[PDB]
Scaffold this active site. Structure first.
Site, PDB file in Angstrom:
ATOM      1  CB  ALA A  41     114.575  62.416  35.553  1.00 48.48           C
ATOM      2  CG  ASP A  42     120.412  65.386  34.581  1.00 46.40           C
ATOM      3  OD1 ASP A  42     120.033  66.577  34.584  1.00 46.40           O
ATOM      4  OD2 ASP A  42     121.590  65.043  34.346  1.00 46.40           O
TER       5      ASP A  42
END
Length: 84
Positions: A41-42
């Site tokens: 993810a970020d």
């Protein structure tokens, strides 16, 4: 040789979980990986992740951790000794 202790078991055990989907190695600790490469993810979702994590240890991330923060590699060695 050495390398047998909870210290190197915390980051390893935790990674052993994501390793399933991430299919990566916990020894990939590097500043050229970050959550984008390492994590799936970020930083957007990681914001709350660490934010709540630091709350469990009672310490400012951008303040305390900032003393030696940069990439995931830092958090790894951090939570490793932090808990031991």
């Amino acid at each position: 040789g050495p390398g047998s202790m909870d210290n190197d078991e915390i980051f390893s055990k935790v990674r052993s979980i994501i390793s399933e989907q991430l299919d990566k190695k916990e020894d990939e600790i590097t500043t050229d990986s970050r959550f984008v490469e390492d994590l799936n993810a970020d930083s957007l979702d990681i914001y709350e992740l660490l934010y709540l994590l630091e709350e469990a240890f009672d310490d400012k991330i951008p303040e305390n951790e900032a003393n030696e923060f940069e990439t995931v590699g830092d958090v790894v060695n951090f939570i490793k000794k932090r808990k031991g």
